[PDB]
Design a protein around this nucleic acid. Sequence first.
RNA 1: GGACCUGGCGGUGCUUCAUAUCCCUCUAGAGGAGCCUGUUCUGUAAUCGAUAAACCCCGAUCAACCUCACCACCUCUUGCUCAGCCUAUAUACCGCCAUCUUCAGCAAACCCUGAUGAAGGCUACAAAGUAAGCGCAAGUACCCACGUAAAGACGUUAGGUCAAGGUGUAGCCCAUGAGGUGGCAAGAAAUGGGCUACAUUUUCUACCCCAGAAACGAUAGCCCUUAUGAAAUAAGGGUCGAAGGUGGAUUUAG
Lengths: 105, 101, 37, 584, 192, 132, 304, 67, 122
Amino acid sequence: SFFTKLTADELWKGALAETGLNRGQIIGEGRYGFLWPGLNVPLVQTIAQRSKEEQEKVEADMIQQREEWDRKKKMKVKRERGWSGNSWGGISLGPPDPGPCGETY
Amino acid sequence: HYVDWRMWRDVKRRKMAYEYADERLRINSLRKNTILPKILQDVADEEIAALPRDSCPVRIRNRCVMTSRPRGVKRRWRLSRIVFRHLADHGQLSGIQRATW
Amino acid sequence: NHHTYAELMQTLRFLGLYRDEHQDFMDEQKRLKKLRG
Amino acid sequence: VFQDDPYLMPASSLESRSFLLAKKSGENVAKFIINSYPKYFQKDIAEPHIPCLMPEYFEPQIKDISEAALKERIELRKVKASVDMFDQLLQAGTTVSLETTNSLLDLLCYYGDQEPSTDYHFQQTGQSEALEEENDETSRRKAGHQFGVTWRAKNNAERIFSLMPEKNEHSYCTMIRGMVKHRAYEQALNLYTELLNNRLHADVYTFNALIEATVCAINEKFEEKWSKILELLRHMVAQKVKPNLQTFNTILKCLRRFHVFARSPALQVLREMKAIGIEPSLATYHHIIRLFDQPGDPLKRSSFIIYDIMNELMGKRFSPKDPDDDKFFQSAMSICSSLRDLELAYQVHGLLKTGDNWKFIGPDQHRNFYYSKFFDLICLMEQIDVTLKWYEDLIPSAYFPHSQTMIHLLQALDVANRLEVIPKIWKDSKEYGHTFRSDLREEILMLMARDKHPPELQVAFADCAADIKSAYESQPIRQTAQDWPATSLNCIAILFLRAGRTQEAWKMLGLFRKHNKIPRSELLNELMDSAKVSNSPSQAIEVVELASAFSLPICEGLTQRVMSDFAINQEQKEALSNLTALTS
Amino acid sequence: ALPPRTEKMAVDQDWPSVYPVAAPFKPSAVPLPVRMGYPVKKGVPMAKEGNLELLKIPNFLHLTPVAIKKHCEALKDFCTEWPAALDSDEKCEKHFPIEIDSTDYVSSGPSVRNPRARVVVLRVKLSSLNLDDHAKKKLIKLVGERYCKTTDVLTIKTDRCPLRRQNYDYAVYLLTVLYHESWNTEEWEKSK
Amino acid sequence: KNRAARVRVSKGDKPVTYEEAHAPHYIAHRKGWLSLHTGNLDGEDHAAERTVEDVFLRKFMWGTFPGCLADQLVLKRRGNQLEICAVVLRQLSPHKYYFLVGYSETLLSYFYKCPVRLHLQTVPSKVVYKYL
Amino acid sequence: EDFIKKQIEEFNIGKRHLANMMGEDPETFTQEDIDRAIAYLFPSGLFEKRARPVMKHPEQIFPRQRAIQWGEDGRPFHYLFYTGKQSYYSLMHDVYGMLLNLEKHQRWLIKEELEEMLVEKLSDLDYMQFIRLLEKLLTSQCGAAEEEFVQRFRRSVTLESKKQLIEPVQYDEQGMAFSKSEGKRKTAKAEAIVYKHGSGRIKVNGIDYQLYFPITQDREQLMFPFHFVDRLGKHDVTCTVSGGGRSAQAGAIRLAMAKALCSFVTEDEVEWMRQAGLLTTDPRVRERKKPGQEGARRKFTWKK
Amino acid sequence: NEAGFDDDGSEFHEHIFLEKHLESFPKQGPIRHFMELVTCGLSKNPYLSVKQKVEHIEWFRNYFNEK
Amino acid sequence: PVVTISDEPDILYKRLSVLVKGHDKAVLDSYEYFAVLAAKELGISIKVHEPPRKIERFTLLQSVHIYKKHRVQYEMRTLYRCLELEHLTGSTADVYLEYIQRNLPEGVAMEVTKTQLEQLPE
RNA sequence: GGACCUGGCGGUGCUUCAUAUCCCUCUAGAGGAGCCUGUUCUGUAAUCGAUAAACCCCGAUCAACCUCACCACCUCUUGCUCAGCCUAUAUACCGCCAUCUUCAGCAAACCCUGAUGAAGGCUACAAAGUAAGCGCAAGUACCCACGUAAAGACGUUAGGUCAAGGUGUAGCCCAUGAGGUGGCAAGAAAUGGGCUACAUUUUCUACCCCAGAAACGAUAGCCCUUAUGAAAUAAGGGUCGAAGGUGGAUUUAG
Ligand SMILES: C[NH+](C)c1cc(NC(=O)CNC(C)(C)C)c(O)c2c1C[C@H]1C[C@H]3[C@H]([NH+](C)C)C(O)=C(C(N)=O)C(=O)[C@@]3(O)C(O)=C1C2=O
Ligand SMILES: [Mg+2]
Ligand SMILES: [Mg+2]
Ligand SMILES: [Mg+2]
Ligand SMILES: [Mg+2]
Ligand SMILES: [Mg+2]
Ligand SMILES: [Mg+2]
Ligand SMILES: [Mg+2]
């Protein structure tokens, strides 16, 4: 029941259990694909709805963009090793933080 | 699309009680009146006991308009204790304060 | 009645005029569950 | 209609129209969703029943082949469905009654065998606002053509009109009106002759359509068409039908098409109007206004009928009668602007303020034209205090000023020598979205750098010129990569010097060198005066060097000033002598 | 954005014109830096440009004393005057005898069905009846629960028919047929 | 401990608005109500369906102006004039804003069958009363 | 600060705009009228008188931001800057110096008020030592200058007065003299009318005291004020009474007759009977049961 | 509070005097007593209109005859 | 300014008293000012009265599963302000009453109005 | 293994206290009898959850059918639902709470001390601490500034609930899901909490406290009638006329 639904901020707080995800969407994209005139397509004044080929191609582009998104999450970052991997002994933290007394290191 | 099956079971109870209210009303008065012969009622009895057992206003459970919880409902807003607490504590129900007398 | 309510939410989400975060969750979780289950 | 949030206010007329059409989009967009799914909105809660709020059903509910289903499909305006099932009734052999065949031919003649347009028609005024001053004679040839349905020979209307058994006046009338509406003028005239042969009566709308058809007929002289119009009105009187306001307004629209030879017939038509006793409308006055006002007339005695008109029209309150009553006010201020008449402009602004007559402005484009012309004229011949009073009274409450007005808004201030008001109207223009208008920028910059001003006005001018330079810098990568005007560069440079923003003046001397624009001798001479004040021989040599690099004929005098006014070293003296030798 | 109409607006500008109708705040329209909300420990009450507390306040901005005065210039058109029926309650009782209660219960939202808005009660004075001698005894014994003795008022209540106007009809009909049955002498009045 | 509408203290970096900050014991001592409907007074009938529609409006406008409603709405209800005053942010395009205004403006009118009016109030960034 | 300056400008302009929308467009719109105008303009309905809207000069709204203590040389202005408590230590140095030069010649401020005048945070023992030195300076025979020092640090007292408010004598009825007072105790109300002479008579709700009060404890309660003031059979009463019970009604009457007899007895004896405790209301009222208890203070069975 | 809501001009004598729809049987019978009882109940009904009152009457009339 | 003086003599309203129930005394007495000044310049005789507030207090449980001893208590503050109009005309009625009715506040507003119209017996 | 730092503990010292709590004290009870209602145990084909303080008239401000998830029997397959599941895990959680708390601490960011260790940071006639923020306090509700309410952070107890609802993980979809019909709530016993008593400051009647008279105790059991309900639990009358003689240890509340 739409009445028993809830905000996503609340669904994740329960899923993660870290106290003991909708960004790739345009403002009018629907499964039915009734591309509107104030949303998606700009404001000729003609209501319309795309076909079975434009829908499938656009949603295929979207799922591929998700896949590349999970790729940019699942790259590898290169950490220089200090005295061994999984150590901290030769790890170079950066330059010291600029002094609030108008200073620099 | 109903919160649960039990809620959907009452929405069915509500509906066919509301449609089957006139027939039951007529024969029932005929029951608790003292004018017709002792035998002239035995017949009307059949009609009632035979009128289906999902419209008798004895099976209506005033449950929760938002989340099916039978016991713990306040009638004036049709809400359970904790849902009414949630809304009145978030401040979207007018007039409801915290009692400090 | 819960039907006009929830089914209009169904149709308006499928028209893309409504974004419900809850159905986005179940959509996404059921996809990641159909990947393995 | 607009919201009060400063982010959501429209700044321009185009932005306001865009917001309004976006809102109207959201409206027919909710209508489409609700009519597509009526089951979700059938539950009424308000008492009483609000049938303008219950959803509209467009699908035919009667599926059996019946005249009730024909009436349902005609009422739903489904042209193809009505035609197809009328063919179904003819195949079934059911006699279709005369009234419902009449309703079917009514629909067919109204729509021209096409379905009604799914878009509620608010298009076809999408002309750009940058071409409102040239060629209203070719703009007519490409703007008088709505792409309407041309009457095709052998259409469904003609098929029904041939198929039905007993022909009556309403059927013939609707057929003639449909042919006139879809530009079958000769066919409509022939069908009117067939009506006269069949001894039927044509109504007022049919006779007006026939008048329009006779005028729109090709290759006939105005005298012949006028004689035909007189014959049609004689036929009207002989058929005992009484003419009316729309009849005579159609006549007036046609004689407006008939130009100079038709001016006296318009006066005769309005006199016969008043003699028969039907009140002329604002559309009637619009028609004879636009007839008598034609470009190229050397007399303007045709334009004196506007004072005859208002002398009949003061103090009266009007109701809607005719479609061009909203065009009346626009036409008459076209005349007021053309003849440059402040008193008559005020007179019809008063006629507007009488009662509800403000309604007869009508649409937003007409409103913008009306108030633009009114404010132009106020700026052109009124006194500057009442011009600014009308400015604050009308802008932005009544209309959004067009780009041209901005320039004019200034010319009045320049004539009145009230240049102190320049920063506030500049700020208003920038708020209204005139930031990227190069002609405005040029106009305030010349009017602003023409004269030496008191210092507080100078520093306010410095802030304004700084923001103009900021906008010019903050136009990146548009196809109108408008090169920095030398006049604008010179003016902003003179103004920053006058207010004392000397280092900024030196930077845009560098901008002069970057953009290869020739600086002005006055700007130069002010730069030497600033260098004299600052005692900077290097800056003096810099401006001499730029003058020599642009090979200007002031450079010798500038060098002589540098020698006379600064203690210079010998290598700089040698360099300046070499520069003068290069220029010589 | 835009520099607001608040500092565009000056003094002697008509506030009934600025706010015609009841509408929520709109602080950009409002030329008052009104601050609302329990402040922070080392701070001020919250500003005006974004408050929800300044939104949830009913907002009687639309109706200022001067708006009341100018509003009713026009609202003055629609009123006659009362006669010299006099503030004296006995004088209006003499002039117009009966009294009726016929009320509305205005709510707020989608519908206007409050059934209890059909309550109609009628108060009448026998000293305004004036045509009641021994026939009065009849009326009293007939109406049992009414006629409190300290004040001579009869109160008949109707809530038996759904509409208020036919309830008014039931009050007047019961009054007149109670009156006619009271003036109807009956055969068993003597064997008391 | 009471955990009803109390955003707990983080580390001093948690932006929070007046509404969220105040706890339910300040519900009309410092906060007030976000929905002004008359049904919760002494004598009235339809308060239940007013609240059932209330939670609907909150969630419809939450899902229909996706990620731009800064703080929660003010569902006032005078006469048959339901009002959805808002505090929506300044990120989406104004034509999109006017669109969702119109869409709601008519859709809740045909759902609830009365005049429904949205008076948006655009704000640059989500406001902060205190950092918890 | 520029913040303070433009806030000021905005208040002034908005105050004039406030008198326009109202009707006091003449320039002098006082602060009381400002509070009046905003009250109506936007109805509060919030229990906290700070949580309601407001329109004051930015001065009172925004707090006191201390000025910069050093210019563009470094070089801090006050000589006691590196103590961090310039104002407090300058005051202590000054008070010590006046004690010194006075010895060569020969209520109190609260901590928050002193911190407000010094615009600096202060320790309680710092306040205590300041007060101690100031008391040293008044105890010592000081001159008029150091008197104005001690008096700009000392503040007002606002003493109240504890004389019973005497009701006026209403010389009325036909020609008699009475006083009509009131009394309240435990949901009971008693309005009492006492005539100066009359030798004894009560008419509690129409009947006498032996009929409305069959209990001798109630009759003793009704005796109490007279037998204290030695005017037993010398005045007469008539009392209307609502609510309460058999003892609450008698107590409300007792208070009402005492608070009416005050006008007929002398001021020294009205002070005497106030001391005796017949002129003060009894605030002891029934308490409230609590959710989870078995009474107001009574709890249930086992908790430990 | 009663906008619309006409009820075909009930006007006070169709709602509470059901004698015109009573269809008199021999009045001394218990059935006719019932009709007095049910008639007074439908008279004191304000929620039902006259048309549902008369279909309530005809229900009993139909069934009373049916027996 | 369409007036349309029609036909029949007045309905003669005595004591049209408006009882204003609310959740907020500050809205109620602002309303009192709006109606008192309106009746002042209307000419109609108004009087003020405060019908005393009723608190609907009630108890619920605080924890979801157990702990009946720990309870929450909620309350409704219903306050009343009576604004009784005496000696007013029938035409005077649906113009003042109408002005106020349309200009009613939101959820903190009820306007229960009793009318005692006078008449002649028949 | 040696030596420490911090915390907890001590049938750990000194001092100062608790006040309805620590004792001596004051008032009314529990524990003894009957009844009502939970729980354990036994039983049944017959839910689940709470289970020292902080479970035990507890989820229930409430089960004849319904509720209902239990059991029996018989049926349903794109099933009110782009299914469902009251299936398992409260030791994945959100949510809403208990408890210390009838507390006053929790602290970002710095700085110093300790040979730059875990860590520590007190002296007002002053020896290194300064502090935003949360909490008490303050301000509010009720009749006052009093009292009572509300409030009481960080964390503790993997304390309570996947069964209010939502939900991760794992599972079922001939099933663990869906519906219909009928039963499940009995005491060889025990215990928690209440109610009423064992009378004489009592009992019955008037009266609602100036009398007459007596010189006791079931809200259980059986019978009658009524209420509500399709179908009796409740209510009144009748009848009867129990055990019971103010309850040990211990304990509760004020
Ligand atoms: C057997 N112990 C180690 C245990 C285990 C679990 N859960 C698991 O390990 C299961 N994990 C799986 C499901 C296999 C993933 C457990 O989940 C639990 C407990 C302990 C209990 C003890 C409970 C007890 N109660 C019932 C009276 C008790 O003495 C207390 C108490 N504080 O009074 C408890 O702590 C207790 O309630 C409790 O919380 C337990 C568990 O939760
Ligand atoms: Mg490794
Ligand atoms: Mg608690
Ligand atoms: Mg468990
Ligand atoms: Mg199961
Ligand atoms: Mg507490
Ligand atoms: Mg506190
Ligand atoms: Mg556990």
